[PDB]
Amino acid sequence: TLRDTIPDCALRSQTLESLDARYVSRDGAHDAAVWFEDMTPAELEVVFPTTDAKLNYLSRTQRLASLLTYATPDTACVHGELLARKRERFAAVINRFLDLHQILR
Amino acid sequence: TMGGDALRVPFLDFATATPKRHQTVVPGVGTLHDCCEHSPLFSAVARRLLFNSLVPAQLKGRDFGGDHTAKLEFLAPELVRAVARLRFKECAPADVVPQRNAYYSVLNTFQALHRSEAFRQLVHFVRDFAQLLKTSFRASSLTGRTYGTLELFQKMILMHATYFLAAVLLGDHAEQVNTFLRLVFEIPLFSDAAVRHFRQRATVFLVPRRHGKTWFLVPLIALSLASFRGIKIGYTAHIRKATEPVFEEIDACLRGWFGSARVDHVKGETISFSFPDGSRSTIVFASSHNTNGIRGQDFNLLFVDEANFIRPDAVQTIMGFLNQANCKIIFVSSTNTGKASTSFLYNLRGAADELLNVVTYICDDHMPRVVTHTNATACSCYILNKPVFITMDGAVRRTADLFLADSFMQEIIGGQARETGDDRPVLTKSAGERFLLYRPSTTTNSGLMAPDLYVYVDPAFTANTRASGTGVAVVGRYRDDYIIFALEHFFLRALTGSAPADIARCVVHSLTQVLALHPGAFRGVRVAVEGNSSQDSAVAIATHVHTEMHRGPELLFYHCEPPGSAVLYPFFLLNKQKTPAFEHFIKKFNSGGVMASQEIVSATVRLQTDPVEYLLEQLNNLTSDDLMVAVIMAIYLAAQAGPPHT
Amino acid sequence: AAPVSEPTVARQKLLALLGQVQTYVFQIELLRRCDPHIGRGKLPQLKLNALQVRALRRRLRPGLEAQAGAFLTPLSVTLELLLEYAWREGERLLGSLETFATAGDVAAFFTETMGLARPCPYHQRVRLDTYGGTVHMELCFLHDVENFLKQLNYCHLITPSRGATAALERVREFMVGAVGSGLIVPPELSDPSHPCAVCFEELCVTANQGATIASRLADRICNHVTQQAQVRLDANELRRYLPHAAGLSDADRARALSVLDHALARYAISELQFWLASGDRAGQTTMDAFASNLTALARRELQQETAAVAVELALFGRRAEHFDRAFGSHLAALDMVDALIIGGQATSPDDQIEALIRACYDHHLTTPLLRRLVSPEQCDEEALRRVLARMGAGGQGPETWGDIATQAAADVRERRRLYADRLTKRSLASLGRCVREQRGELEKMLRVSVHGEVLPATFAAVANGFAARARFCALTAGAGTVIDNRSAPGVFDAHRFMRASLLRHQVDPALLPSITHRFFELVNGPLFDHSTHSFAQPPNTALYYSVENVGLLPHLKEELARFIMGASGADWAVSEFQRFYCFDGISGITPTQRAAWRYIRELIIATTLFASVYRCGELELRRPDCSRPTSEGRYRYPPGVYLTYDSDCPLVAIVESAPDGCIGPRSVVVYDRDVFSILYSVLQHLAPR
Ligand SMILES: [Zn+2]
Ligand SMILES: [Zn+2]
């Protein structure tokens, strides 16, 4: 009793809105289940087999994407300037963090 | 007695599609994916709604909802009736067998903290403190403003005491107790660093005249004794004529809202509270300063009352207590602004961190007293009880006439005036310290330098005056920052016949040294001689610099076409560009973008003081300035403007 | 003890649903980077999950709608954000996947999902819309939501109700996009330099050695609107989990391991020199150690990459092109810093901090200046011991090089040793702070930052005040006998009579503290409470917090602290006949707030003098922003005279409400603008009893 949506649909040649109107938006829809399918692909678990490893990659690619979009002619975005300032300050901070410990010796 | 309803919930075995290799168990909820632990937006909501059950009802607040902490756990009736008809899946049998075990076992370590008397001691201490301060500290029985208020330091002291006593009496629960004391002090969202700060020992307090200094420590002790079991709070003081009042005010309430049978009292010495099962905790008074306090067993507090003028020959027992392994010498004090600097303790701020805290109402600069104005208590605001006899004056002129150190006191006259006049510092102390300490070695990182030197000379053409110094700076670009290669603060010999050449010889000597230290680095040196003082004298300096340098890098001068003239003179006129130059400098300096060369050159500032240290003393006057002006302007020139030439 | 309340099991059900939805958003953020040919395999799963999220609303929709209008809580705010971000990004990614298998190109799939061709959808317009002047701000960053919610909190006595709960729906529309993920924060909208509202209380509560907070607040990373998540990643993570995979029930789990071992047996480090370098070059240096560590890290990364490629080839047959490979050409032409910030999908962002610390800290550093970092508490303890022990008891000017060069060489020979002896003998307390600050500023930039619990808490704390005010405005309209007095056919007489009868007495200067407290209690906002805690604080402190966070000019704090310090009829009565809360002839933000402080002072002093003259009334001067709801749909507004801050009908006098608290048929209430007419109507009721 109280079946899920995956035993309900059984057909996947359609658009999302049709299925919405046919299974979840009908007045007679019993809607008596909540079960989120596992969407991670095995072709990705076999290489990143750890939530920490799946999060480090998910953050590295996020940083890459945020670098690529900010690097017709508007160019007047505060986020590009913020990323530039952050990169410059990070470079200048690591600069005075290796030399400072070179001096202390 | 059983607490709230958040630690008794049933299983709610919804479902999971994640492999057991990933799933984690959050207490109070089922078993969810591992990604729900690196997301604080969930692991900070699912954990706060748990400890919001251990918190008693006398600690939620004063208007928090009748039955629950509405600000954390409240669902509208419509939403409750809507999520009621929401039904998850049902866990598979082979998966529900271990899931229920994991769930009911990860929750047992909470229904086990709610029972241990070691934690019940802390809960009782905090709840009694709250319920007994509700009506301000008085002779109540413990059975329009009507609720008492702890000022800021009266709360910092309570936190310093409670967090340490919890970390000491509860070591096996150093995680379930931090995130409970957070909820009990209404201090969540607080990183573990700024809470572990309260775990440290020997945190000195400097308090103004009265501020309920003594009125607060006696209830603190009375509740920290009759709640915990196995601590001996040492309470030293000044001359022991002041400690007997503490005796009486502790034992009056300690016997007032409790039974006298458990109140053990000997005159002039220790006081002891006994518990109905062979337990006793005392407040043994180290005020004798002779014996009975050298051997330490469970002191852990050492409530030193007044460390302003330390008691004679009583520092030996204190320093011996500092050797005890679990002692947190609270070190209360009272600088009543009658001296404003208990330099016996105030010198601690020199080399230390997170040690002492001052409850001050006037800053270092006595002009921005309005910084801490809305914080000064309203009870201590009494005046002559008459604004004016007959006068119509605004609050500004009134407070000017009625200044009296802004607190009816007789604070130090001089220095920072009474009318603030929008006076503030400009360069942060932190950037200043880094300017002093981190100095790139330019002679060995020459590849990082731009091939142009910029020099500014800000001349003074008098002698035998303190403002008669000539400032010289030679700077350049280092990466995208600015670095100082040389500094001079030069003082004319009196009645020389050649002041411009003396100044020129000074700057040429500086340049030469900079050039020799970095051979082949520079293609150009650009020189600006400020001409505000004397155009002719500035021109003469440029001419001598020009000639002397003629004995490679090309030498250029900034030129100026004075108003109404077609002539280009080799001087610089400082006017409209001052404000932009200063503004840019301040921003660059504060962000770490201006520095001094490790091998910075100075002939004139070498024997008495470090040149960078000397420059920084001038710079800290931003709100004799020849050096500061030369440095700021040399940098502005290295920055961007109109072209200077040959 | 068996019966547990429904709003307790409902909260657990909502927490479980929040966990499921957070997991789903994680899977979504993963599929936005996997190869499309593999993502298309999970097309039915993604479609089913989007269907489930759609069906999850339309049930929580009316519940969360009735919640947003009555006392939001930090649970149903993050729940709304996540159920919106899922319903958004799931459908967006599904559209981007169904666009695939039609064009069949990958480099244009990672420009749709990862958003490389968008017009930067991180901008918004707030238009606070106060009284007198409608100031408008734009929400670009994460701290720009804190600095707007604190502004709307401070300017709450000046802002209409439905003009604020319509500028909060414009903040939530941005938060759904920025903090809606709740799992990772894009580097664009995160400025850790700007301090938050809870790291201002840190400095107020922790120890300050002089150094007023205005100067301590500028050396902070604020660590609360974004966190660090402390991700750790082992070395041989691929070889560990290879003999244990989801499918692979065949012996292919052995041939895959064989190919892994066979391929294992089978950063632009050349750019460090252009950085600033000090000291001697011959021999070991910090730069050399850093280069060696980075070379080791790059070698581990390359080995992991080739092993992953070989394993995917041997197991499934096709080498997949994920985001880090389809755009792998842009990971080659990367500078040292641009590839140090990002990078290390094999290593961890903590391994780079390890490679830096192992380079800056060797056995040759020093005896001192090394123990203060490993124990910054023993240093201050020793300093305290030391303090206690000390307090217990010419001519011949040369032109050529041979002389000026020699004198400059001597001067630099002295000065290079001068500061070198400064950094070692003195300046230990300054170095122990500079290094522990640069290290924090580094770890905050390199570690994986996720999200902080601040925004969905302060948003709720701010919105609850306006929700409660709009709720009290409309809950009293439906009551028993209403005596609405905003129409004045015969009220001038009773207003002037009471104003004259009250202006005849002095303010009783023995009551000025009890008036200053009730002034700082009305003026303060709903966010910074600090006065209804169990360990309460004086209302002046709860106001200092709320007024110092939003940077207020110092020349206005005296106008606030010294407002009722002076209290004749001048500066006493400011309201006209019916224009009590009217800001018609005032524009701006500060001169529009002075006019509100004046009305609040007039109300407080008039109520005090009315309690003093006509002793019959009690006149508990209350505020509707308090009285949070109990277990369900009950608010129990007690009797008193509420300010309500609404320029439409400000003063609401609840003289006799009910013996249980609610507002029903025995709840005669008096609406009015003016204060003295309110007091007259209260007198006409409370006196003949
Ligand atoms: Zn943008
Ligand atoms: Zn912060």
Numbering used by the authors:
A (entry chain C): 12 to 82, 96 to 129
B (entry chain A): 35 to 177, 195 to 602, 614 to 685, 705 to 727
C (entry chain B): 2 to 267, 306 to 432, 478 to 651, 654 to 775
From the paper:
By using the block-reconstruction method, we were able to improve the resolution for the structures of the hexameric and dodecameric terminases to 3.5 Å and 3.6 Å, respectively, suggesting that the complex is intrinsically flexible with unrestrained symmetry. The backbone of the polypeptide, as well as most side chains, were clearly defined, allowing an atomic model of the terminase complex to be built de novo. The 85-kDa pUL28 (which has no sequence or predicted structural similarities with bacteriophage TerS) and 15-kDa pUL33 remain enigmatic for their structures and functions. pUL28 folds into six distinct domains: spool (residues 1–119), fix (residues 120–191 and 533–563), strut (residues 192–226), reinforce (residues 227–413 and 510–532), regulator (residues 414–509) and packing (residues 564–775) based on its roles in initializing the assembly of the terminase complex, and all domains are engaged in extensive associations with pUL15 (interaction area ~6,700 Å2). pUL33, consisting primarily of five helices, threads through a compact “triangle” formed by the spool, fix, strut and reinforce domains of pUL28, thus firmLy stabilized by extensive interactions with pUL28 (contact area ~4,500 Å2). In turn, the pUL28 N-terminal spool domain is twined around by two N-lasso domains of pUL15 and pUL33, further facilitating the assembly of the complex. Unexpectedly, our structure reveals an intermolecular Zn finger formed by residues C121 and H124 from pUL28 fix domain, and residues C101 and H103 from pUL33, which are highly conserved across the herpesvirus family. Furthermore, the pUL28 fix domain, comprising a three-helix-bundle plus an antiparallel two-stranded β-sheet, appears to fix the orientation of the pUL33 C-domain. Two clusters of three-helix bundles formed by the strut domains of pUL15 and pUL28 support each other, along with a second intramolecular Zn finger (residues C197, C200, C223 and H225 from pUL28), immobilizing the “backbone” of the ATPase domain.
